[PDB]
Design a protein around this ligand. Structure first.
Ligand SMILES: [Br-]
Ligand SMILES: [Br-]
Ligand SMILES: [Br-]
Ligand SMILES: [Br-]
Ligand SMILES: [Br-]
Ligand SMILES: [Br-]
Ligand SMILES: [Br-]
Ligand SMILES: [Br-]
Ligand SMILES: [Br-]
Ligand SMILES: [Br-]
Ligand SMILES: [Br-]
Ligand SMILES: [Br-]
Ligand SMILES: [Br-]
Ligand SMILES: [Br-]
Ligand SMILES: [Br-]
Ligand SMILES: [Br-]
Ligand SMILES: [Br-]
Ligand SMILES: [Br-]
Ligand SMILES: [Br-]
Ligand SMILES: [Br-]
Ligand SMILES: [Br-]
Ligand SMILES: [Br-]
Ligand SMILES: [Br-]
Ligand SMILES: [Br-]
Ligand SMILES: [Br-]
Ligand SMILES: [Br-]
Ligand SMILES: [Br-]
Ligand SMILES: [Br-]
Ligand SMILES: [Br-]
Ligand SMILES: [Br-]
Ligand SMILES: [Br-]
Ligand SMILES: [Br-]
Ligand SMILES: [Br-]
Ligand SMILES: [Br-]
Ligand SMILES: [Br-]
Ligand SMILES: [Br-]
Ligand SMILES: [Br-]
Ligand SMILES: [Br-]
Ligand SMILES: [Br-]
Ligand SMILES: [Br-]
Ligand SMILES: [Br-]
Ligand SMILES: [Br-]
Ligand SMILES: [Br-]
Ligand SMILES: [Br-]
Ligand SMILES: [Br-]
Ligand SMILES: [Br-]
Ligand SMILES: [Br-]
Ligand SMILES: [Br-]
Ligand SMILES: [Br-]
Ligand SMILES: [Br-]
Ligand SMILES: [Br-]
Ligand SMILES: [Br-]
Ligand SMILES: [Br-]
Ligand SMILES: [Br-]
Ligand SMILES: [Br-]
Ligand SMILES: [Br-]
Ligand SMILES: [Br-]
Ligand SMILES: [Br-]
Ligand SMILES: [Br-]
Ligand SMILES: [Br-]
Ligand SMILES: [Br-]
Ligand SMILES: [Br-]
Ligand SMILES: [Br-]
Ligand SMILES: [Br-]
Ligand SMILES: [Br-]
Ligand SMILES: [Br-]
Ligand SMILES: [Br-]
Ligand SMILES: [Br-]
Ligand SMILES: [Br-]
Ligand SMILES: [Br-]
Ligand SMILES: [Br-]
Ligand SMILES: [Br-]
Ligand SMILES: [Br-]
Ligand SMILES: [Br-]
Ligand SMILES: [Br-]
Ligand SMILES: [Br-]
Ligand SMILES: [Br-]
Ligand SMILES: [Br-]
Ligand SMILES: [Br-]
Ligand SMILES: [Br-]
Ligand SMILES: [Br-]
Ligand SMILES: [Br-]
Ligand SMILES: [Br-]
Ligand SMILES: [Br-]
Ligand SMILES: [Br-]
Ligand SMILES: [Br-]
Ligand SMILES: [Br-]
Ligand SMILES: [Br-]
Ligand SMILES: [Br-]
Ligand SMILES: [Br-]
Ligand SMILES: [Br-]
Ligand SMILES: [Br-]
Ligand SMILES: [Br-]
Ligand SMILES: [Br-]
Ligand SMILES: [Br-]
Ligand SMILES: [Br-]
Ligand SMILES: [Br-]
Ligand SMILES: [Br-]
Ligand SMILES: [Br-]
Ligand SMILES: [Br-]
Ligand SMILES: [Br-]
Ligand SMILES: [Br-]
Ligand SMILES: [Br-]
Ligand SMILES: [Ca+2]
Ligand SMILES: [Ca+2]
Ligand SMILES: [Ca+2]
Ligand SMILES: [Mg+2]
Ligand SMILES: [Mg+2]
Ligand SMILES: [Mg+2]
Ligand SMILES: [Mg+2]
Ligand SMILES: [Mg+2]
Ligand SMILES: [Mg+2]
Ligand SMILES: [Mg+2]
Ligand SMILES: [Mg+2]
Ligand SMILES: [Mg+2]
Lengths: 154, 151, 154, 151, 154, 151, 151, 151, 151
């Protein structure tokens, strides 16, 4: 059928016609895979529950989502540790179907450096969580902790 | 930087994370936005870029977007005894176009469809006040699907 | 051991003996993978929640099941659209662990034709749902919508 | 007609469905039904096809079934000093059979087992009023497993 | 760098130095994959609900876990059947998201032998369960039933 | 003995189990236990095996453990103007060792690290009353990671 | 080209027969005949060949038979404390044998079995009046399976 | 070496031009010109070539044109009960043709289309006064697409 | 054939020794000896070889030693504002050297390190009274590691 006509082709500098056909399947409000960096405050000796509602905010463009499937969690000490000590952080995953008892701990080897640790959620436990829910318990000698949660907004 | 999929893992597994990586809380996003614009008979309508920024598309947190290509479809029936048709005239801040990319329907009961691509060199940002393209048609509304890149 | 005896062999027209052994593991009430076509009524501008209890009925032979793992959902406009308009349908999946916000929309390109759309549930979200639960919200300019839900009865 | 498995998808994904397919709300079903029938000493019992239709097997919504093959096992101990045994005589509407497929136990503490296949040419439907096969045995009950096709 | 020094090498009979580096990521309370054999009592004609709390006990070393992801379930008749009968056992899986209706039955071919049966949980249904929850309903002519549950403690 | 993974199964599936297998309700367990021990200046401390048995490590149900290898790290800052250091002296019931596996830090702001392996021939059990190794250091505490096998 | 059978017909076709063939309304027939015989403790029982001519076996229309092999199993439990056993002494019209082919059960609850082949050169017909073999055993009944040629 | 364009520049470079070339401010141009023409029922309409010279097409600066091919579609619905149809009779200054290249729609709601190629040896210029072809049809309007060479 | 060791023994075996060999109760020994030496600011310290003969190193039974290489690290923090540094001037009984092999830390919190090899032809014994090298540095203490041959 005289193969192709159109205008120019590939390496071009002008508008070119698109020979559309049938109206396609669309979606104005799709899903989105994201890594949300945010900080949380932590006292000494007390485990802070990281709420899922912190992922939902306009500071991440996600204030339009009402549910999230968490995949992995990573956390860095945000501040310096007490005098003479090396930073440290722990993570206990929490699941609406059953809270786990792990304390995935990572320590720093230099006092001036951040302590880092993180955990992966298996596929059979990636389920939606709402703002009211909590993702995990954080502990640390440091007063603030920076997280980077890899999750799927839908 | 040690993550896997397809694995047989049915429990949590520790990730040996190290240095705080480079992050971004407001990343960009390539989208194919759908929305409809009403039109009149024989009168052109300037589609304002400001319809791509809205909470109905999760984009009310953006102010500037790089349009890439437009595709238009008629949304309502055409006048009596007429076949549907729609025309697209690109519009750019640096100098409007005089093209009228027209597509007609070969069955009155069908939508008319057309689109145009914006070459790489003309892919600059546009804000809400700017325009995208003129849309003529004999059909009282028109449905668009604009592939773009929010930033 | 004189290989095989029996009667005839393969291309046969008479009863043939079966040299059974130990009573096997059985199951009088097994699982079943199905695609259940049913219609639902839809008003204009109002999202109708498709109840899971509609899959459970004797019209599908499934009135003997009390739970179902939904996999995918597909929907067609069952009636004609308003005057001058083209049919359209939307689907917002619902999950007991967290309702999603997608509006998977599919439109027709001919007024006389059905509009079609559908979505797939990932593996990590295939979990049982009971009659009381709902699968998704349907919207459309058409008054009835025909669905075909692929699911696993157990 | 675009569905996958094993995928790394952890969110819903749109399916580009088109024409309303061919459907069936009451499809067929191949089954291996288990049930037990009591028996007497030296007296044959005509297993009625109507035991395969019941809500205990999810089949009370069927009326006709294509039997394919029968397999029998004794369900209770045999008389004292005896070894278990069971006989199967096929029964068809078009003309009963005189076979007596017999299987015996070589250990008194074991079940006797036997079965028969129905060739393709004799695989017609049967309703509740019809019979399947005569079952003789010295054991007070008998357990069956009938591979069939409900329709 | 003069490749390796150390002491002896591989086939050795004395302590050897380990040239450690940075403090690693640790975990004092990890997960554990286990197969927990325990018995349950069963009446005649009555289905007994196997509680998840039976997996949590110091007799399995697991009295330190508060959640469990069940994978598969296997069960053997623990005692002899009534007079003149052959042992038998059934299993109906139970899920907090929706109880199933299967009756996976396995029978013995010798009266003096155990009847055995079991079922596998798909990946999409491996979710945590707490002590309060139940795994499945057991039936049998025998008064006791021995199970061996393959599960993942976390 | 018929179990699979990676399968497309989304419903329960029957397992054809047979004979009651060999079981064990209290199996063994290889572990890498972490804990910290305080230390003084110039004085050695005998790490008691009894710190590996505790509910904080899920091991309070064990009484005997086969140590395999020790690795030590300083847990607090060193004295002023000093670099961190730690020494490990293996201890065995059959005859203590006189080695002093020492590791120092090349940056005052860094931990000192060292470890030792126990050869196969010296891998016997140890109970709570036994000792593991002497730990010297200029740092007020020390953090250990003992690979072992509980039984 | 199809699913089942496929091209076959599926309706009748004509056969172009020729000359009238050779026929036989009363052919031979090779069988495995099952039947039991009572046995006294410490007495040998002469099995009659006329037990092979019976309508139970569809063979009441035969008067002769060519015996190939004799297999025997114990049919009832043995005396207390005793394991089952059975012996077979072959008998021929041309000269009786003296072998006592015996077999014993290793489990009191199991059948004792044995059998013997008759060689080609001893395979002649035997009428109802004849005897095939002598049976000795501690169980009262003994089941037999005889592969033979009815003619 | 990069992502988009890569090595290019990205800023201007100098061209080392030479002698002043041959130029043409007013070149030729090959086009596909779209336009409609009203048609009466049962009357043939002579299409004027001067419909190809218009600013709507950027061609008001041309006075001649070399026509290659003529394609026609029906633009309005047909009378009731009737299927659309259109006929094209070519016209040439050297001798008018007599072919009525016709086309019919198979669906009343669809356009009837047809067209004809003009061979090389009949491809001469045609001024506005000339005619290209006669159009007959049952629909009142008929849209045309003409591939031609403006010069 | 097994898991660990496997075939070995696992119990003692006999050795079929022969003539009485050549023995040496007091062999040589190659070592890396660690020890520190105090250093004054702006003064060179003569390291005595008699620091290599000590029971801390199991070498109190030696009287001579053949030095191969000398490596040095700073043991205490440098003055304020200053980066660590250390210099090594070799010394030999046949003629002292004049090289000041120096090394500097690039980070104030890090050790300054340097070392020098002694070539074969200068590797003779050295008694306790002798000196191995002169040390200069801004830190007060300086740790040494010397690869040498005790004999
Ligand atoms: Br271009
Ligand atoms: Br398109
Ligand atoms: Br599409
Ligand atoms: Br989508
Ligand atoms: Br991100
Ligand atoms: Br990241
Ligand atoms: Br605090
Ligand atoms: Br703490
Ligand atoms: Br702080
Ligand atoms: Br919580
Ligand atoms: Br603290
Ligand atoms: Br790696
Ligand atoms: Br696992
Ligand atoms: Br990382
Ligand atoms: Br990075
Ligand atoms: Br990344
Ligand atoms: Br980014
Ligand atoms: Br994107
Ligand atoms: Br999109
Ligand atoms: Br609107
Ligand atoms: Br118009
Ligand atoms: Br607007
Ligand atoms: Br610009
Ligand atoms: Br046959
Ligand atoms: Br079988
Ligand atoms: Br089986
Ligand atoms: Br099953
Ligand atoms: Br279906
Ligand atoms: Br389907
Ligand atoms: Br309505
Ligand atoms: Br609406
Ligand atoms: Br309607
Ligand atoms: Br809901
Ligand atoms: Br509406
Ligand atoms: Br495809
Ligand atoms: Br995903
Ligand atoms: Br489809
Ligand atoms: Br289809
Ligand atoms: Br299908
Ligand atoms: Br079907
Ligand atoms: Br089936
Ligand atoms: Br079945
Ligand atoms: Br019954
Ligand atoms: Br009987
Ligand atoms: Br009955
Ligand atoms: Br029939
Ligand atoms: Br060694
Ligand atoms: Br290490
Ligand atoms: Br690590
Ligand atoms: Br771990
Ligand atoms: Br285990
Ligand atoms: Br096991
Ligand atoms: Br009871
Ligand atoms: Br029961
Ligand atoms: Br009992
Ligand atoms: Br999964
Ligand atoms: Br329950
Ligand atoms: Br019972
Ligand atoms: Br296998
Ligand atoms: Br499945
Ligand atoms: Br098993
Ligand atoms: Br085993
Ligand atoms: Br195992
Ligand atoms: Br074990
Ligand atoms: Br282990
Ligand atoms: Br561990
Ligand atoms: Br402590
Ligand atoms: Br010290
Ligand atoms: Br202690
Ligand atoms: Br020992
Ligand atoms: Br023929
Ligand atoms: Br013939
Ligand atoms: Br014959
Ligand atoms: Br034959
Ligand atoms: Br036979
Ligand atoms: Br007797
Ligand atoms: Br006797
Ligand atoms: Br006797
Ligand atoms: Br007789
Ligand atoms: Br004789
Ligand atoms: Br012969
Ligand atoms: Br150039
Ligand atoms: Br030039
Ligand atoms: Br030119
Ligand atoms: Br051109
Ligand atoms: Br053109
Ligand atoms: Br007219
Ligand atoms: Br007309
Ligand atoms: Br006409
Ligand atoms: Br004109
Ligand atoms: Br003319
Ligand atoms: Br020409
Ligand atoms: Br030797
Ligand atoms: Br020797
Ligand atoms: Br020597
Ligand atoms: Br040596
Ligand atoms: Br050494
Ligand atoms: Br000084
Ligand atoms: Br100084
Ligand atoms: Br100096
Ligand atoms: Br000295
Ligand atoms: Br000298
Ligand atoms: Br030399
Ligand atoms: Ca938003
Ligand atoms: Ca039913
Ligand atoms: Ca414990
Ligand atoms: Mg570090
Ligand atoms: Mg339209
Ligand atoms: Mg369409
Ligand atoms: Mg029986
Ligand atoms: Mg058995
Ligand atoms: Mg330290
Ligand atoms: Mg017997
Ligand atoms: Mg027309
Ligand atoms: Mg220094």
């Amino acid at each position: 059928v005289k193969p192709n006509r159109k205008s120019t082709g590939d390496n071009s500098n002008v508008v070119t016609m698109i020979r559309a056909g049938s109206y396609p399947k669309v979606n104005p409000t799709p899903t989105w895979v994201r890594a949300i960096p945010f900080e949380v405050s932590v006292q000494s000796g007390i485990a802070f529950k990281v709420p899922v509602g912190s992922l939902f905010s306009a500071n991440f463009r996600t204030d339009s989502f009402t549910s999230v499937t968490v995949m992995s969690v990573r956390a860095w000490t945000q501040l310096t540790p007490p005098v003479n000590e090396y930073s440290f952080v722990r993570l206990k995953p929490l699941f609406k179907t059953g809270d786990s008892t792990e304390e995935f701990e990572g320590r720093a080897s230099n006092i001036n450096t951040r302590a880092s640790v993180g955990y992966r959620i298996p596929t059979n436990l990636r389920q939606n969580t709402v703002a009211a829910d909590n993702v995990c318990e954080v502990r640390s000698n440091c007063r603030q902790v920076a997280l980077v949660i890899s999750c799927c907004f839908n």
